[PDB]
Amino acid sequence: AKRTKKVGIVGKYGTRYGASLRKMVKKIEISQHAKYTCSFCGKTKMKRRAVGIWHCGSCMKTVAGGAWTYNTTSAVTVKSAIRRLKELKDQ
Amino acid sequence: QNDEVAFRKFKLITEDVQGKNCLTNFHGMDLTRDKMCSMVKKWQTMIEAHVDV
Amino acid sequence: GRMHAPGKGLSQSALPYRRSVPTWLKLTSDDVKEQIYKLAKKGLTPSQIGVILRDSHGVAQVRFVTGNKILRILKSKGLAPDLPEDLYHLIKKAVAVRKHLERNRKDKDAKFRLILIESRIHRLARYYKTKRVLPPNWKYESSTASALVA
Amino acid sequence: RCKELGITALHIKLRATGGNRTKTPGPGAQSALRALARSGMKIGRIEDVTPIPSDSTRRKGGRRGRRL
Amino acid sequence: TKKRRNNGRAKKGRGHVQPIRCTNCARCVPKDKAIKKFVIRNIVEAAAVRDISEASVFDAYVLPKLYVKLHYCVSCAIHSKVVRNRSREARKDRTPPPRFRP
Amino acid sequence: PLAKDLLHPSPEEEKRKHKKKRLVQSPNSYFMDVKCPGCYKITTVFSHAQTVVLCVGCSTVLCQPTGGKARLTEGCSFRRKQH
Amino acid sequence: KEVVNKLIPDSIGKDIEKACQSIYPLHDVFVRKVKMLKKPKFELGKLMELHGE
Amino acid sequence: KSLESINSRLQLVMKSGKYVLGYKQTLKMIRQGKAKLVILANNCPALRKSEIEYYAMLAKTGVHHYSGNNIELGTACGKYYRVCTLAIIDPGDSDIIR
Amino acid sequence: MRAKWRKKRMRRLKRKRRKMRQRS
RNA sequence: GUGAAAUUCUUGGACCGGCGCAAGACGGACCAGAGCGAAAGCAUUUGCCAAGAAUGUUUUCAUUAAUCAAGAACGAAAGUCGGAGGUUCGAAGACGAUCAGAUACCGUCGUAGUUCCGACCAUAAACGAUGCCGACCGGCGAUGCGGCGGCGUUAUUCCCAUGACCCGCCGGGCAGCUUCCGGGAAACCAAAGUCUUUGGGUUCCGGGGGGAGUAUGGUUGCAAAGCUGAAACUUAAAGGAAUUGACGG
Ligand SMILES: [Mg+2]
Ligand SMILES: [Mg+2]
Ligand SMILES: [Mg+2]
Ligand SMILES: [Mg+2]
Ligand SMILES: [Mg+2]
Ligand SMILES: [Mg+2]
Ligand SMILES: [Mg+2]
Ligand SMILES: [Mg+2]
Ligand SMILES: [Zn+2]
Ligand SMILES: [Zn+2]
């Protein structure tokens, strides 16, 4: 059955730290402990090892990423901009 | 120009001066305000294009 | 009026009052059946088969010249598609919209169109399961539908 | 002042307030230009140089305007 | 009572029309509701054309026109007398007043 | 007119009216014989064809599908089928 | 040099108008504006041969 | 238009032609000289891709680098598992022109 | 009053009532 | 800067003119009783991505449909939360004026906000103050899209295609003018007609004015608030459309 109405993963914190802080950390913890689909082997086994470090259990590929998500939106936009500037630089 | 149209202007920035003569080179052109405003009319479409070249 | 659009278009096809095969049509029933079988082996849906037959081979209605409809002929020979054509195309459209949506999260218009498409899919599937064309436990799953089409 | 500094002709560039604000030149344009003409100064080209935004920031006064 | 069939604006098959600022008071007026006047006035007064022509360095100089489009809220349009109240029947005609060429 | 004869319309207004709104539905399309120059065989082509029709003996296009009617390639002869 | 001299009568706009007649007629076709974005180092000989011979 | 065409043709290769799914079976079919087309996901390891290309050159068979990945190639094949390499023995649908 | 300002006055009064009831 | 002023900036060069740099907003004029979208809404170029109405169809399925409690998606602006950004404008606030007073209208400055991304909220005169689907019932000239048919002009080219115009027809739209179709209390409406000659299908919803969209209960929401929602008591009128008169800074 459903065990909690809204706290979900931050039910481990009990009544402590405040509702807004628990709500704030809930999404970050979900993204932190989620298992991502590896873009090298295709298996959903890419998970965080340390802060910013993401490892895949299948192909043993370690990727440097975000603290809580596998990649940040900032880095994705940066990669797109770098690709655009590289293809502009040469002709 | 001796007998060209008058609604066209030129920028002609100065690069070098020798003696009492300032020497200019092309810097840009533009139409006059009245010509541009008179060209735009209703019940018609205008097409605007820009290109770096 | 359209099912999911506020459009009241009238563009249809006016089938002629003459049900007789035209005299210049030399094609016999077996020849048309062979053409349908070949075009089905090429992978054409019955709508495309009818379009090709009308455009190129000069047959007006397959039902008029053979006595049977195209899907009837395919099902009789046993090479009719497992999914109905329009249901297949609706699932294909929904899969395409979902593929576009998982990259463009802000496309709320695409979400609205996806909702409309899935409503159409479920209504068509309910009709087909009532007619027992589909298995009675047939269900459209948005996650696993992508392998069923294309 | 121009005559005592040896200038005999003048190109004219009329300007209004421009920008997001009004585009009609003030009451002084006509009299200033006519006085320049009647003072012996020669007149050359005339052109409007009012700043026209391709589109501007929000004009002051609120959405209900200047209530008077 | 519904005074006008079109509600005093040109919006027919639209939901929203972008607003414009009144040229007199800077009021946010819908673009299809505002009174528009496109004045094409000589850049010099008709009293001063002769003096400018005399003081021109050119012989056949064509004086510039001034192209200004004006937008008014109906408050400023009525107060500035460009538009006037009309009788109930006379409100229904859309033909602009004649130019008075002669 | 209070006494329009709905039973016997003349062919002019019968042809101008919409295909569905006629007294009896009649398609506006037809079938045509198409002669490609340099080829002897004859292809029966729909007047409103939605596909590119090709000669089986020559790699030549006969019609280009458009919004309403397939535009025949130039140099190609065509006639009607039984009105 | 021969860009500036050919935009002096705006032959570019005239051939643009001539080229666009098969799509939709155009009447007031001009190069409304050109601006100078980058310049090559100001070689004095080039400026001199633009002014002189 | 190329991606939708290859997806439709791959769907029609299934249910109508002889194929084989996977790396080991693809190599087996290639060295038996009966694989007429090899399709590779761009997710393929570069060493595996290069080796399969060398095998294809030796056997004179075509290689198509699929514009998806092993998950999407598996979906395009109609399967619920990832396929990274596959070989068509005979299409039955003119994916491979005579 | 203007109906909008009666609405605003009523909203202020409703907030005050909610506060007083919560105080118990 | 204003009706006039004043706060304010100014021999420290303020304002003005010129040349550049930086930033963030904003996409004029073209722009229309024009288009698209379920609405909210949507206007710089170019590319990509899916989507769509209308039209054409001698293509296919063959009743799969219309409206819909519960439920679901979207939902202007303002407001809330987190992160960027903050040019202008500008709630609050400060000051200068006006004034009998002036906590305002006017002016100067200026916070939140207005900008982007992510998450809430679910309200507008969210209007056509006008449910959806279907059928019938006047005329006319236009407009946008698609298709069809025709003198001709034009673009290149040698001709037809194909564009740009001209004249018509068909289908779907935004509308407009006229009408003793008919309706209505009338204003007005070709729908607000086809209604005592009352019945095409269906959904939501009103029962004199206040109290009151209030109290209470329940529920959603971080909050603001949203949804459901009385009663006591009070009142003989409140309202709608039109006419005459009076009055109008
Ligand atoms: Mg006033
Ligand atoms: Mg009134
Ligand atoms: Mg609105
Ligand atoms: Mg908002
Ligand atoms: Mg913030
Ligand atoms: Mg200010
Ligand atoms: Mg009903
Ligand atoms: Mg009551
Ligand atoms: Zn991996
Ligand atoms: Zn105003």
Swiss-Prot record, chain A:
Zinc finger boundaries on the chain: C4-type: 38-59
Is ATP-binding found in the keyword set?
no
- Asked if the record carries the keyword Ribosomal protein, the reply is yes
Q: Where in the cell is it found?
A: Cytoplasm
Supply the alphabetized keyword list.
Answer: Cytoplasm, Metal-binding, Ribonucleoprotein, Ribosomal protein, Zinc, Zinc-finger
Concerning SUPFAM superfamilies, the annotation shows: Zn-binding ribosomal proteins
Gene3D superfamilies, alphabetized: 2.20.25.30
Q: Which Pfam families match?
A: Ribosomal_L37ae (PF01780)
**Which family does the UniProt entry place this protein in?**
Belongs to the eukaryotic ribosomal protein eL43 family.
* Name of this chain's protein: Large ribosomal subunit protein eL43
Q: Tell me the organism's taxonomic lineage.
A: Eukaryota, Metazoa, Chordata, Craniata, Vertebrata
Gene responsible for this protein: RPL37A
From Swiss-Prot, chain B:
Going by the entry's taxonomy, the superkingdom of the source organism is recorded as Eukaryota
Work out whether the entry's keyword set contains Metal-binding: no
Q: Name one GO biological process term.
A: ribosomal small subunit biogenesis
Q: Does the keyword Cell wall biogenesis/degradation apply?
A: no
Q: Which UniProt keywords apply?
A: Acetylation, ADP-ribosylation, Cytoplasm, Differentiation, Isopeptide bond, Nucleus, Phosphoprotein, Ribonucleoprotein, Ribosomal protein, Ubl conjugation
Molecular function terms from GO: mRNA 5'-UTR binding; RNA binding; structural constituent of ribosome
Q: Where are the transmembrane segments?
A: none
A single Gene Ontology CC annotation of this entry is:
ribonucleoprotein complex
Q: Give the UniProt subcellular location, in the record's own words.
A: Cytoplasm; Nucleus; Nucleus, Nucleolus
Q: What is the first-listed, main subcellular location in coarse terms?
A: cytoplasm
**Assembly, per entry:** Component of the small ribosomal subunit. Mature ribosomes consist of a small (40S) and a large (60S) subunit. The 40S subunit contains about 33 different proteins and 1 molecule of RNA (18S). The 60S subunit contains about 49 different proteins and 3 molecules of RNA (28S, 5.8S and 5S). Identified in a IGF2BP1-dependent mRNP granule complex containing untranslated mRNAs. Binds with high affinity to IPO4. Interacts with DDIT3. Part of the small subunit (SSU) processome, composed of more than 70 proteins and the RNA chaperone small nucleolar RNA (snoRNA) U3.
Similarity annotation: Belongs to the eukaryotic ribosomal protein eS1 family.
- Put simply, this protein is called Small ribosomal subunit protein eS1
- Gene encoding this polypeptide? RPS3A
Swiss-Prot record, chain C:
Alphabetized UniProt keyword annotations: Acetylation, Cytoplasm, Isopeptide bond, Nucleus, Phosphoprotein, Ribonucleoprotein, Ribosomal protein, Ubl conjugation
* InterPro entries in alphabetical order: Ribosomal_uS15, Ribosomal_uS15_arc_euk, Ribosomal_uS15_N, uS15_NS1_RNA-bd_sf
Return one GO MF term. RNA binding
GO terms of biological process kind = cytoplasmic translation; negative regulation of RNA splicing; ribosomal small subunit biogenesis; translation
Asked if the keyword Ribonucleoprotein belongs to this entry, the reply reads yes
Cysteines joined through disulfide linkages: none
Its subcellular locations are: Cytoplasm; Nucleus, Nucleolus
Q: In the record, which positions carry N6-acetyllysine?
A: 26
Q: Which residue numbers mark the cross-link Glycyl lysine isopeptide (Lys-Gly) (interchain with G-Cter in ubiquitin) in this sequence? A: 26
Modified-residue entries (Phosphoserine), positions = 29
Known SUPFAM superfamilies for this protein?
S15/NS1 RNA-binding domain (SSF47060)
Q: What about PTM?
A: Ubiquitinated at Lys-26 by RNF14 and RNF25 in response to ribosome collisions (ribosome stalling).
Function noted in UniProt: Component of the small ribosomal subunit. The ribosome is a large ribonucleoprotein complex responsible for the synthesis of proteins in the cell. Part of the small subunit (SSU) processome, first precursor of the small eukaryotic ribosomal subunit. During the assembly of the SSU processome in the nucleolus, many ribosome biogenesis factors, an RNA chaperone and ribosomal proteins associate with the nascent pre-rRNA and work in concert to generate RNA folding, modifications, rearrangements and cleavage as well as targeted degradation of pre-ribosomal RNA by the RNA exosome.
Q: Which HAMAP family match?
A: Ribosomal_uS15_A
Q: What is this protein called?
A: Small ribosomal subunit protein uS15
Q: Which organism is it from?
A: Homo sapiens
From Swiss-Prot, chain I:
Q: What is its main location?
A: cytoplasm
What domain of life?
Answer: Eukaryota
Species source reads: Homo sapiens
Q: Where in the cell is it found?
A: Cytoplasm
Query: Which InterPro entries does this one have?
Result: Ribosomal_eS32
Q: Name one GO molecular function term.
A: structural constituent of ribosome
Q: How does it assemble?
A: Component of the small ribosomal subunit.
**Has UniProt tagged this entry with the keyword Ribosomal protein?**
yes
Name under which the protein is recorded:
Small ribosomal subunit protein eS32
GO CC, sorted alphabetically, is: cytoplasm; cytosol; cytosolic large ribosomal subunit; endoplasmic reticulum
Q: Does the keyword Ribonucleoprotein apply?
A: yes
Q: What else is known?
A: Initially thought to be part of the large ribosomal subunit. Crystal structures show eS32/eL41 to be a small ribosomal subunit forming a bridge at the interface of the 2 subunits.
User: Tell me, what is an example of a GO biological process annotation in this record?
Assistant: cytoplasmic translation
Q: Which family does it belong to?
A: Belongs to the eukaryotic ribosomal protein eS32 family.
Q: Gene of origin?
A: RPL41
